[PDB]
What does this fold into?
Amino acid sequence: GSHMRNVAAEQQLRELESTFDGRLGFVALDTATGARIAHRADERFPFYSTFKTMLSAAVLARSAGDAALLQRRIPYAKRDLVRYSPITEKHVGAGMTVAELCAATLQYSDNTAANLLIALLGGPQAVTAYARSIGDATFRLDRRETELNTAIPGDERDTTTPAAMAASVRRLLVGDALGTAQRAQLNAWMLGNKTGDARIRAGVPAGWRVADKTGTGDYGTGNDIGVAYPPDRAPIVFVVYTTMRSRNAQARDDVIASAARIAARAFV
It folds into this structure.
């Protein structure tokens, strides 16, 4: 890569942002060099379900000191279910194990699973505290699902910046934030995500493996974060936040995929 190619990529991101009503917040980091491609990197965006990566990391960190935590079963009832709970709705009554809840919240974006894990940790502020412990001074989790999706202009609740989330994703999936085994489990869960096939994954070359977590608020909104593992080069961190409200899902997904494609072009 080169600085000149990264500058061209940033111009291409400004051009991409001009094709929709709204803002694009983008960081890609080439871990081979630390080179960064950035656009609105220090502006806050609603994170939506992308916080579930930080939540699951906090659970995994606790599990390193409690060998049974991931196998603990959490009961819950129909009245606990919030909207968008495709896995937890199947197991009302005796409930699911902590590991199963992490897998469901990461791979299917299950909202009740996230709420149960937030409660396990002691409330949303425990996720913020975990973010601080890994060096993220920006992330803040203030509410539960689904109230954290309100995305009110100027409201900093339940937001982060592209730069802070990219740094945290790097530390969690590629770096030293977690212990070996927990870093690996977080990668394994996010590699198996089922909700992101049209987002970052759609913008990277065939043969790259992607560990991602999507976020979607109201209809037509969304984002995606993760790490791509090229087959023979170093991992690349991708963070794509937006404030768009698109006409349909594919229009929004095309923007996210295009943003990833711009950075992949610069780093190959």
